[PDB]
Amino acid sequence: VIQGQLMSVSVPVNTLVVDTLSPTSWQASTFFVRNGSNPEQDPLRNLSGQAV
Amino acid sequence: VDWRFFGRTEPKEENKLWFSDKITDAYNMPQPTFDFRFPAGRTSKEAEDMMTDMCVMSAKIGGFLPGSLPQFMEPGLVLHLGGTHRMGFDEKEDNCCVNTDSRV
Amino acid sequence: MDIKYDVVIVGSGPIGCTYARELVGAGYKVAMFDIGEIDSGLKIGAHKKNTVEYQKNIDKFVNVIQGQLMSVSVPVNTLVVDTLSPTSWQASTFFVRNGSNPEQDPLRNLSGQAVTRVVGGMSTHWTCATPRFDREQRPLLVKDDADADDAEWDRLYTKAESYFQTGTDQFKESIRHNLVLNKLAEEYKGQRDFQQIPLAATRRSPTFVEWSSANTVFDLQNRPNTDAPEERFNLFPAVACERVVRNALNSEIESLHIHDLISGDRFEIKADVYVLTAGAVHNTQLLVNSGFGQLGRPNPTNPPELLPSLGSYITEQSLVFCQTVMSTELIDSVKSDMTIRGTPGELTYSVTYTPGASTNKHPDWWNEKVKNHMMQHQEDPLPIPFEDPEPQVTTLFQPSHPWHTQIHRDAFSYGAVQQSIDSRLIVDWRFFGRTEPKEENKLWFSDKITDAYNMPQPTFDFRFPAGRTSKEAEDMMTDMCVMSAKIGGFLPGSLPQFMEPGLVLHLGGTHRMGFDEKEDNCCVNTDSRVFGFKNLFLGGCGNIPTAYGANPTLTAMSLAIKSCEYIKQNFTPSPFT
Amino acid sequence: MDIKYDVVIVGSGPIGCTYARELVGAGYKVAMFDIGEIDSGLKIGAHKKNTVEYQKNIDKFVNVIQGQLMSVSVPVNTLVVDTLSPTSWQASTFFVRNGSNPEQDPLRNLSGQAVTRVVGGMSTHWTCATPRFDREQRPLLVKDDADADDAEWDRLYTKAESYFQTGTDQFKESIRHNLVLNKLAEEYKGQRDFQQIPLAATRRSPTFVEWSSANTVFDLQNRPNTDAPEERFNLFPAVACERVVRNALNSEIESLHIHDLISGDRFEIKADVYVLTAGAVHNTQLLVNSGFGQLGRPNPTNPPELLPSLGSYITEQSLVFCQTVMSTELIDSVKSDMTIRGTPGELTYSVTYTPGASTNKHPDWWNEKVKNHMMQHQEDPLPIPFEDPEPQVTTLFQPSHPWHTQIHRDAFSYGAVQQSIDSRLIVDWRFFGRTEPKEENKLWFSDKITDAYNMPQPTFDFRFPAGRTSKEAEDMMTDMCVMSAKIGGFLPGSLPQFMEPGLVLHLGGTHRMGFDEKEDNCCVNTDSRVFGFKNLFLGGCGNIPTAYGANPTLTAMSLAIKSCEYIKQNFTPSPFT
Numbered sequence A: 001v002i003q004g005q006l007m008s009v010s011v012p013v014n015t016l017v018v019d020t021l022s023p024t025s026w027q028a029s030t031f032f033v034r035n036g037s038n039p040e041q042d043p044l045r046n047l048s049g050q051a052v
Numbered sequence B: 001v002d003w004r005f006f007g008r009t010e011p012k013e014e015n016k017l018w019f020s021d022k023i024t025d026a027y028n029m030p031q032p033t034f035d036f037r038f039p040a041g042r043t044s045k046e047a048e049d050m051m052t053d054m055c056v057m058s059a060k061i062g063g064f065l066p067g068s069l070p071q072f073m074e075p076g077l078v079l080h081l082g083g084t085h086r087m088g089f090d091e092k093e094d095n096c097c098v099n100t101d102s103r104v
Numbered sequence C, D: 001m002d003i004k005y006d007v008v009i010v011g012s013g014p015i016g017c018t019y020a021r022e023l024v025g026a027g028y029k030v031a032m033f034d035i036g037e038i039d040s041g042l043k044i045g046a047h048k049k050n051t052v053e054y055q056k057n058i059d060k061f062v063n064v065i066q067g068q069l070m071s072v073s074v075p076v077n078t079l080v081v082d083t084l085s086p087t088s089w090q091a092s093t094f095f096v097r098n099g100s101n102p103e104q105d106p107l108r109n110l111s112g113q114a115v116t117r118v119v120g121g122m123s124t125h126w127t128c129a130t131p132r133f134d135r136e137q138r139p140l141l142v143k144d145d146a147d148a149d150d151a152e153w154d155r156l157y158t159k160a161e162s163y164f165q166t167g168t169d170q171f172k173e174s175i176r177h178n179l180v181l182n183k184l185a186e187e188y189k190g191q192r193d194f195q196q197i198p199l200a201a202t203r204r205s206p207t208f209v210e211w212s213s214a215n216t217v218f219d220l221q222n223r224p225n226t227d228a229p230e231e232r233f234n235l236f237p238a239v240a241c242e243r244v245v246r247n248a249l250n251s252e253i254e255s256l257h258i259h260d261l262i263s264g265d266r267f268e269i270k271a272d273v274y275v276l277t278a279g280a281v282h283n284t285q286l287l288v289n290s291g292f293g294q295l296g297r298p299n300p301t302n303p304p305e306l307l308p309s310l311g312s313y314i315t316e317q318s319l320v321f322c323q324t325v326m327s328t329e330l331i332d333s334v335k336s337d338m339t340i341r342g343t344p345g346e347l348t349y350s351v352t353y354t355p356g357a358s359t360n361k362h363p364d365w366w367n368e369k370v371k372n373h374m375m376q377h378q379e380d381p382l383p384i385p386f387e388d389p390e391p392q393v394t395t396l397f398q399p400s401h402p403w404h405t406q407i408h409r410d411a412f413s414y415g416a417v418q419q420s421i422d423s424r425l426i427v428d429w430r431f432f433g434r435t436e437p438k439e440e441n442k443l444w445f446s447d448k449i450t451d452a453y454n455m456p457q458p459t460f461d462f463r464f465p466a467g468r469t470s471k472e473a474e475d476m477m478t479d480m481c482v483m484s485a486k487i488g489g490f491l492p493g494s495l496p497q498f499m500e501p502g503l504v505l506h507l508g509g510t511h512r513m514g515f516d517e518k519e520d521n522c523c524v525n526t527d528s529r530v531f532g533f534k535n536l537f538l539g540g541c542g543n544i545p546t547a548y549g550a551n552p553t554l555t556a557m558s559l560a561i562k563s564c565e566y567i568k569q570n571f572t573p574s575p576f577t
């Protein structure tokens, strides 16, 4: 219940590597802004656990 | 038994909450961005001394549960943010936003 | 250490040992250098699996494999660790650390790609699958004469198989093997052929297989010796070879610069003939460090003076993997010749079959094993003997399924949360696709960043090519899903998936072969001779210029055999002392 | 093979090699048998970490170790997998499978306990820490004379230290080592003393350390040879020793029954002297299989004829573990003597210091290393050189802190979530607690279930004794949390934790030593002679009867040296034929 109503304030751009996609799948050539990421955010100067 | 220790953070001018002039959140509002580091000196020192204290104290009750070993939580998971619009007596001398009647 | 040799071979894997076997045998004075050390026992460069302990504890050999795989190129790490103590030193950037390569784009890598520096190279740990390539996968050796090209490949393959001790009958008395093979043969009756994976291996007993390696090809002992009093060979382990020195005309190699890693010092070693068999990656690194191709980030504005195709058109295979848990119908079929009376555990319990009956679905050897296990182990609920050897099944590459298949039990991938399931139920599935050679797919070497041996850091610029390569990969994955369902369902934790690029370790095309340097965009001819150079040869998967699905080693060895024939015809062995 | 030996030694670990060094050197005709095979290159029994490749890729050796640790007792798996395809075969019970031991209570186990089957034993992979036990941890060799007991232990330890090549200077010029050492010295000034871990090793160069092994003690080459022409030794690898035969009176050993694993044949070997050095677990196994102690599940109602304490009073240490990330404070102190002009990356950038200046905090050699690193690698944010050797710090066991400590970088434990942090920052902490011998803590061997070598399956019945052992273990965990915080905070993924029981691999007391078989509930005397038996000797950690925290190998070796003194006094070498 708690997790279902804590929305993250500021989530950095995701840079996890996923290299086991099928060759056939659409694949990014950059770590572009997606899934609600905030491109302004320095991931090492964040309160990543902060939520509203 | 759960053990939680909360340490205090020295208020620093460089630690900031700001808002983007380009990126917006799900309500079309200027998106919040943090520029935050636990201050060096007392905050950092107290924070490690606090870890030790928990480790010492909890041992009088039992050993740690596997899976829940002593750790620092992600910054902000505690959800006790303060000082974003702080109170003081005087706007310039106390670097603040409201007086003691919470008036801007 | 001697000053002058007839032949000098860089690297002691199975390709390097092919050269040594031919040239030492023909009376050349041969020196061989390896950067790695004598490792796996008194038989030098032998298979590490050939111990009693590993064949009794097959789950543990994965650790041996992982222990000699060193990642080729590891991007800068950008994982966020934000639960450190405030007191801990933390940098403010994802700086270059821990052997990372800052030249490597993480989205265009072969992150699974790895190297092995030990005497015997990767043949101390490999799976020993040695299939032949059919026409559609192999380079031409003779132009415009399919039949002569066939006869030449057959001749080389026959020789290579003989050096490696390749056979197809080591698993003929395995229940699990024949169970799976027979089922798949039936299911694809009139559509696909199934057989045992050709394995470089010899059975010694029903519980022990002597797996082949570099040692099988050439035993790596110094000569002259008691059993070979007229041969000359020296192996120098822990010697990093750093470059071949070109003459000013680029017509011949003048020496080999080495670095002895025990003593610390460096030498110039002289030979009539120089052979590079340091692997697809390290052959190329040595060549680039020697002035071939182009150092640094590629740029077509300043095209290299030598071997412009070096490090281009690199191929690596797509690999899909899963494991299955044998079906009820298949396990029940193991005892279909048995008459069973009473309950296990009771005094009255009886399991029999009629030996040599026309109506028996299984041979006498199978039924006898099953009967004995069921009688002697009545607590056990499975009809498969505890000591039954693993399955080793393939349906080889064909135009209507252009992928290699392995349906087997690999030493690699052992894991233990799904080890709640009886190992007798488990079968591995590995499908390998082929990859079109494309100019943009490159292996190149940093002009600033060095590896752990002070050499130019390897960097990949690789993506699986759109078109046929990508389509065939998706069709393959589907094919494995369809085929494996015939045997059983997926084992949880080992669900169908693409493996990380390069983890298959079948890299080819880094120094590819062809008839003509310009027209075939290549680095060596069909004698494996570097274009322009009289006395420099390259061996290994790096020569293979085509899109191939099967394991390449045997094909590489065949090419090395042909290269030695050229050497034997064009260079004179020195007089014995 | 051969007929008759003076001395026969079972096991080629460092303890077996101690008996070989003494006895072969004293003129005895010695044969040694090991169930495992030659595994570490041309130097028989050597440390597998002594290759250039592993000292450059220290992260990979963890695999080598894991690859030769076979779990002693694995309980029946009851993990539930319910997401199998309905089509897959599934059993309706958690039946005995995959090598599980059904005798094993999963809650009274040493799950982490494991054994190595290779020539050289566990010394082919061990960490090499060899500290002495003080009085409180060690068995008495002399009654009622603490100064004579001290002198005897000092004499034996000194000889053992010489065979193992023990020293405390191999890491003296590491900045990380001294960074840590000096900080803890300062923090605990006048309470605890800190030093380098005593290590069986010899430094070969700034980057290479020759770790000691069995090979260091005895080279294991067959004698007679060129360098030992009047010595007689034969090593026989891949021979499972199965039984020692007791004579009618239970006063002597008549023979040893072996199983050659290559041929499959079994043999009866005769000698004057029989030495069992097969490890704490397999010594017991072999003895129980030979009619000593009691076969099968324990029952008091029918006590054993011989050696009733065999396999009781077993001890294993508690082990807590974490890793830390160096504090900002300590990192900054590394460069405190530097003056910095200009910006890094420019030709104008200048890092200097003043040699011999009294205000300097660090010696000249330290400042020279920092300066050169900072000048040569200006894009690096850390002042510690890339090639700087790991820390090797300990505060030895004392009454006020009765645990052994290692503050260091171990091969074991290398992960991949947390390799985001520069390795120069990371330090390992391992505290080892002592365990009181209790009769109810047991190693016993199944009368029905067998192992991979068809021997009685080992089973543990072990829990950490209540009282002092438990209290000390928790105080120890606290001690590590308090101490480690002086250096840095915990590394995420490597938080303070107890390790799986038996992972530390320091099992002792399985065939324990004492003066009197009845009064001291023991199996061997102080010459390691089995009571009642003139010519049977046991060597290894199983002899140690005490609660001990420190690494036991040096102590067991000291015991074997004492034991060889008795043998030399009581058996005549056969004449050199």
Ligand SMILES: *Cc1cc2c(cc1C)nc1c(=O)[nH]c(=O)nc-1n2C[C@H](O)[C@H](O)[C@H](O)COP(=O)(O)OP(=O)(O)OC[C@H]1O[C@@H](n2cnc3c(N)ncnc32)[C@H](O)[C@@H]1O
Pocket: C010, C011, C012, C013, C014, C015, C016, C033, C034, C035, C036, C065, C116, C117, C118, C119, C120, C121, C122, C123, C125, C126, C127, C128, C129, C130, C239, C240, C241, C242, C277, C278, C279, C280, C282, C286, C412, C505, C506, C539, C540, C541, C551, C552, C553, C554
């Ligand atoms: C790791 C592996 C490989 C493998 C496999 C399974 C595993 C786990 N399964 C295979 C299979 O079923 N069928 C097959 O055909 N191949 C399979 N492989 C790969 C196979 O082992 C390799 O294709 C083959 O071993 C390559 O042979 P090659 O002789 O060309 O090269 P190598 O084995 O990598 O050894 C090269 C030697 O060179 C030494 N070296 C490297 N650099 C230098 C320098 N600079 N100086 C001196 N020596 C050098 C390396 O030490 C190595 O020994």
Ligand SMILES: *Cc1cc2c(cc1C)nc1c(=O)[nH]c(=O)nc-1n2C[C@H](O)[C@H](O)[C@H](O)COP(=O)(O)OP(=O)(O)OC[C@H]1O[C@@H](n2cnc3c(N)ncnc32)[C@H](O)[C@@H]1O
Pocket: D010, D011, D012, D013, D014, D015, D016, D033, D034, D035, D036, D065, D116, D117, D118, D119, D120, D121, D122, D123, D125, D126, D127, D128, D129, D130, D239, D240, D241, D242, D277, D278, D279, D280, D282, D286, D412, D505, D539, D540, D541, D551, D552, D553, D554
């Ligand atoms: C694995 C390990 C061990 C270790 C360590 C770190 C690791 C990763 N760190 C240590 C340390 O820092 N300090 C220390 O004192 N010890 C440390 N250890 C443990 C140490 O390696 C062992 O205590 C030591 O090696 C034991 O010596 P020992 O000679 O008594 O026993 P062994 O090494 O286990 O060798 C036994 C040999 O006997 C053979 N064998 C077993 N059964 C049979 C039978 N039936 N027949 C014939 N031979 C047999 C085994 O093959 C083995 O070679």
